[PDB]
């Protein structure tokens, strides 16, 4: 007869309780671990994967399926407006729902990290011109004029250098800044050259992405 105290909460079922039980058959040996030269242990491998983001979600026809992946640009438009990226928020709707991180955030609430964008130029061999991509810092509203854009951080994009240009946003959380893309100058070509081109964009995140709070939310269905 050993005395023992009965703590409250005996028949409660706990979802987060990690339990272990003795195997029924202690004699069967599981299959040996397979040795492979390359070894990967952590989920960090997914954080460096590149994903394409698209804006022209207007068409829905069957025979227009392949053109979705890019956005065309033409010389007919003059000093207009190329693309209007929505507020950068993986949780909210928009281009970010297709990405891996946005799906991962579907069970989660608070996120923070850095953002980088890469651009490469695919024009004609004889063309000359200058492109500029700038991100407006927080506080500043949407750029009405290019003067309000220049006060923010801007990077020069020459046509002799293709993709070594790197832009970094120091910190994004959850309110924030906005990014806009205008026509820096019109792409002009002489006779015997195509009148249309295409532009490819890249987007990734740095190592400083972290998670704090789990959420019991499921987006499916």
Partner 1 sequence: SHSTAETTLDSFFSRAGLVGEIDLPLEGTTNPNGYANWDIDITGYAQMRRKVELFTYMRFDAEFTFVACTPTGQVVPQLLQYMFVPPGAPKPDSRESLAWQTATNPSVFVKLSDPPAQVSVPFMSPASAYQWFYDGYPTFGEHKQEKDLEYGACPNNMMGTFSVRTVGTSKSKYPLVIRIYMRMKHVRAWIPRPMRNQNYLFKANPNYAGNFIKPTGASRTAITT
Which residues in the 19-38 window bind partner 1 by CB under 8 A?
A: 19-32, 34
Query: Residue 96: is it exposed, middle or buried by C-beta count within 10 angstroms (0-12/13-18/19+)?
Result: buried
Q: Is 145 in the site for partner 1 (CB under 8 A)?
A: no
Closer residue to partner 1 (CB): 27 or 164: 27
185 makes contact with partner 1 (CB under 8 A): no
User: Contact between 218 and a copy of itself (CB under 8 A)?
Assistant: no
We find the least distance from the C-beta atom of residue 45 to a copy of itself, in angstroms, to be 18
- Minimum CB separation from a copy of itself for residue 7, in Å? 4
CB of 147 or CB of 214, closer to partner 1: 214
> Residue 14, interface with partner 1 (CB under 8 A)?
yes
Q: Give Cα separations from 11 to 5, 6, 8, 22, 172 (angstroms).
A: 15, 12, 9, 22, 45
Which CB, 27 or 128, lies closer to partner 1? 27
Regarding 66 and contact with partner 1 (CB under 8 A), the answer is no
Residue with tokens 């990077």: 155
| 35-70 b/e (C-beta count within 10 Å ≥ 16 → b) | eeeeeeeeeeeebeeeeeeeeeeeeeeeeeeeeeee
Nearest approach in angstroms of CB 117 to a copy of itself is 29
Tell me: does residue 21 bind a copy of itself (CB under 8 A).
yes
User: Measured between alpha carbons, how far is residue 75 from residues 122, 133, 182, 197 in Å?
Assistant: 15, 19, 14, 9
């Amino acid at each position: 007869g050993f005395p023992t105290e009965l703590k409250p909460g005996t028949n409660q079922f706990l979802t987060t309780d990690d339990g272990v039980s003795a195997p029924i058959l202690p004699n069967f040996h599981p299959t040996p671990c397979i040795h492979i030269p390359g070894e990967v242990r952590n989920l960090l491998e997914l954080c460096q994967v590149e994903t394409i983001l698209e804006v022209n979600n207007v068409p829905t026809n069957a025979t227009s399926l392949m053109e979705r992946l890019r956005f065309p640009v033409s010389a007919q438009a003059g000093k207009g407006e190329l693309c209007a990226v929505f507020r950068a928020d993986p949780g909210r709707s928009g281009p970010w729902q297709s990405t891996l991180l946005g799906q991962l955030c579907g069970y989660y609430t608070q996120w923070s990290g850095s953002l980088e964008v890469t651009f490469m130029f695919t024009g004609s061999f004889m063309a000359t011109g200058k492109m500029l991509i700038a991100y407006t810092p927080p506080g500043g509203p949407l750029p009405k004029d290019r003067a309000t854009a220049m006060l923010g951080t801007h990077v020069i994009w020459d046509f002799g250098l293709q993709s070594s240009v790197t832009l970094v946003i120091p910190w994004i959380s959850n309110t924030t800044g906005l990014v806009s893309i205008w026509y820096q100058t019109n792409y002009v070509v002489p006779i015997g050259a195509p009148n249309t081109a295409y532009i490819i964009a890249l987007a990734a995140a740095q190592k400083n992405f972290t998670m704090q709070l789990c959420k019991d939310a499921s987006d499916i269905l």
